[PDB]
Amino acid sequence: GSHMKLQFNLKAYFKTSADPTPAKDAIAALFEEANSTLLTRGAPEGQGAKVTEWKLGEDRIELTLQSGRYVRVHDAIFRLRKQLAEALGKKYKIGIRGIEVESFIIKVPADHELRMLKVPYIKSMENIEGGIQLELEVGEAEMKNRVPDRILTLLEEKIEAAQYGAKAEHWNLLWQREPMEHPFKEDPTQAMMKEGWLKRGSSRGQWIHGPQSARIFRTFEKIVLEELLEPLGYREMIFPKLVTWEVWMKSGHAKGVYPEIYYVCPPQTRDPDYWEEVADYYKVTHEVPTKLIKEKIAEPIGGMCYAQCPPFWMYVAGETLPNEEIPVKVFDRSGTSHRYESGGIHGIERVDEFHRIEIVWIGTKEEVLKCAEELHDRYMHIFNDILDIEWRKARVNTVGTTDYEACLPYRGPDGEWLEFQNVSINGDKYPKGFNVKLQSGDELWSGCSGVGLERWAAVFLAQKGLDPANWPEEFRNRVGEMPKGIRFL
């Protein structure tokens, strides 16, 4: 780690209506008092902002302002603006207009070099002793909007990622089941195809489930409702599946979800005449003109459901919950989630279109941890007593994700286990993101948990096979009489 000081350097001048040369005695007096009083507020001892030099023009008052991480220059300059206005407006009869930036320099500690990228408002970048120096192309509007703080946070993220969070996974085992005998060793996806349970859909990593596979999905759903959601007092809601930029901005997904989303674009207009060229092209060529269509669709409005819970938060956005209403415990099972997974075909263990029950809870810190614990107890009961599967759980501070993993015997003794279930304590992230308050003024937390039916199927069928005679009695009772598939010649 580099110990170099985080430092902000600002060279700027204030716009004046006329030339305030005579008011020099008052101007110099306020700057010295600012350095000992005003610019010190909100900073630890001797870490306040400093005006290092000052000079005058015939319509401008310039300064060089310096700061560390506290009372930053883009914050301190507006403090000096409001003081200089009141001190010179009443007696000296002179008005201060806008702020003009001449140079904005941030110095940030870093161990390694960074490849410079196209980032808005960053003029140039250069390596210096102990870190990185940024030159900013920023005016007063951008300073008021706190652009420098966002640029700093971005560079700090890039610095951390280049050195620290490089390990693919850091993994912490919490609980593991006693190993079981595994007499079934087929890839469940291949067995399901051979025995007429399902077929590949037209789209990438997409499946069509025949009656046999659908029955399995429905039984897992029934188990989650009856063994978890009902006894724990969860209430069904319907969350939207088309997710807008607004939602992902508030959830934080707009910070990097881009490589994995299926994007959605509305038509630019519903006017048939606008689309006639597309229809005509297809009727003549028997080909869909995708290049033309891309020109005729609007810019993306967002994408298809990715994490499932974010669009729910528009229901509580901007609202205050009464203390009587928490914990809010809800779930949704109203449709499909879409993710652009890695290249290479997979089985149902890794699809581009999946079906998940998303479980969401909101309350105080303690109510959220308690709710998480309730969920873990119910999941353990399900996996041990009903599905009777071999499994473990691992934790990827109480904020974070607990992952459930299970072995797939077709992958061999040294095969990688499959993540099939998770429980996430999200802290204040979502309440803060969507501006959801609690009546008592206590901090609101939330958690979520997603049951991916494909992953449960991949695990259960990999371990138990497709023959009901060899399934746990408790699972068999819930399935009922298996339906027949559609037989082909």
Ligand X SMILES: Nc1ncnc2c1ncn2[C@@H]1O[C@H](COP(=O)(O)OP(=O)(O)OP(=O)(O)O)[C@@H](O)[C@H]1O
Least separation in angstroms between CB 433 and Cl ion: 13
Question: CA 296 to CA 303: how far, in whole Å?
Answer: 18
CA distances, 429 to each of 40, 160, 251, 368 (Å): 31, 21, 8, 13
The token pair that represents 350 in the structure block: 């890794």
Among 212, 219, 422, 463, binds Mg ion (CB under 5 A): 422
Among 454, 463, 466, 471, binds ligand X (CB under 6 A): 454
Among 329, 339, 393, 464, binds ligand X (CB under 6 A): 339
Work out whether 214 is an interface residue with its own copies (CB under 8 A).
yes
Nearer to its own copies, 312 or 391 (CB): 312
- The listed partner (its own copies, Cl ion, Zn ion, none) that binds 87, CB under 5 to 8 Å by sort, is none
Least separation in angstroms between CB 120 and ligand X: 25
C-beta of residue 109 within 8 angstroms of C-beta of residue 4: yes
Among 49, 351, 448, 462, binds Zn ion (CB under 5 A): 448
List, in sequence order, the alpha helices (H) in 320-421.
365-381
Among 307, 321, 407, 459, binds Zn ion (CB under 5 A): 307
Catalytic residue flag (residue 358): yes
Nearest residue to 196 via CA among 215, 209, 178, 180:
209
Work out whether 402 is an interface residue with Mg ion (CB under 5 A).
no
Is residue 309 a known part of a binding site? yes
Catalytic residue flag (residue 403): yes
- The listed partner (Cl ion, its own copies, Mg ion, none) that binds 307, CB under 5 to 8 Å by sort, is Cl ion
Of 63-71, 95-103, 299-307, 415-423, the segment contacting Mg ion by CB under 5 A is 415-423
C-beta of residue 241 within 8 angstroms of C-beta of residue 304: yes
Question: CA 124 to CA 394: how far, in whole Å?
Answer: 44
Nearest residue to 113 via CA among 136, 130, 135:
130
Work out whether 462 is an interface residue with Zn ion (CB under 5 A).
no
- Contacting Mg ion within 328-357 (CB under 5 A): 339
Element (H, E) at 304: strand 302-304
Selected catalytic residue, list 221, 419, 428, 442: 419
Nearer to its own copies, 63 or 457 (CB): 457
Among 50, 333, 350, 393, binds ligand X (CB under 6 A): 350
x/- letters, 290..329, toward ligand X (CB under 6 A): -----------------x----------------------
| Structural Rg of the chain based on CA atoms | 30
x/- letters, 291..330, toward Cl ion (CB under 5 A): ---------------xx--x--------------------
CB-based burial label for 473 (10 Å; 0-12, 13-18, 19+): exposed
Distance from chain centroid for Cα 431:
13
Catalytic residue flag (residue 341): yes
Work out whether 34 is an interface residue with Cl ion (CB under 5 A).
no
- Contacting its own copies within 305-334 (CB under 8 A): 311-312, 314-316, 319-322, 324-325, 328, 330, 334
Nearest residue to 157 via CA among 146, 168, 165, 148:
165
C-beta of residue 182 within 8 angstroms of C-beta of residue 463: yes
- The listed partner (its own copies, Cl ion, Zn ion, none) that binds 276, CB under 5 to 8 Å by sort, is its own copies
Is residue 307 a known part of a binding site? yes
Nearer to its own copies, 2 or 334 (CB): 334
Catalytic residue flag (residue 422): yes
Question: CA 142 to CA 73: how far, in whole Å?
Answer: 13
Least separation in angstroms between CB 340 and its own copies: 5
Give every CB contact of residue 184 below 8 A, 6+ residues apart in sequence: 409, 462, 463, 464, 465, 470
Nearer to its own copies, 272 or 413 (CB): 272
Of 130-138, 179-187, 311-319, 447-455, the segment contacting ligand X by CB under 6 A is 447-455
In this structure, what DSSP letter does residue 428 have? T
Least separation in angstroms between CB 461 and its own copies: 15
Of 4-12, 32-40, 77-85, 114-122, the segment contacting its own copies by CB under 8 A is 114-122
Least separation in angstroms between CB 471 and its own copies: 19
Nearer to its own copies, 92 or 282 (CB): 282
Amino acid at the residue 391? W
CA distances, 222 to each of 386, 401, 454 (Å): 12, 25, 15
Give every CB contact of residue 268 below 8 A, 6+ residues apart in sequence: 274, 296, 297, 298
x/- letters, 204..243, toward Cl ion (CB under 5 A): ---------------------------------------x
Size of the site for Zn ion (CB under 5 A): 3
């060279």: which residue's tokens? Answer: 11
Selected catalytic residue, list 305, 339, 388, 454: 339
Is residue 448 a known part of a binding site? yes
Is residue 341 a known part of a binding site? yes
C-beta of residue 423 within 8 angstroms of C-beta of residue 183: no
Closest CB to Cl ion: residue number: 306
Helical axes 24-36 vs 73-89, angle rounded to 10°: 140
Nearest residue to 171 via CA among 344, 400, 18:
400
Q: State the CB neighbour count (10 A cutoff) for residue 369.
A: 15
Q: What is the DSSP string of 398-425?
A: --EEEEEEE--GGG-TTPPPEEEEEEEE
Supply the residues annotated as catalytic.
309, 339, 341, 350, 358, 403, 419, 422, 448, 455
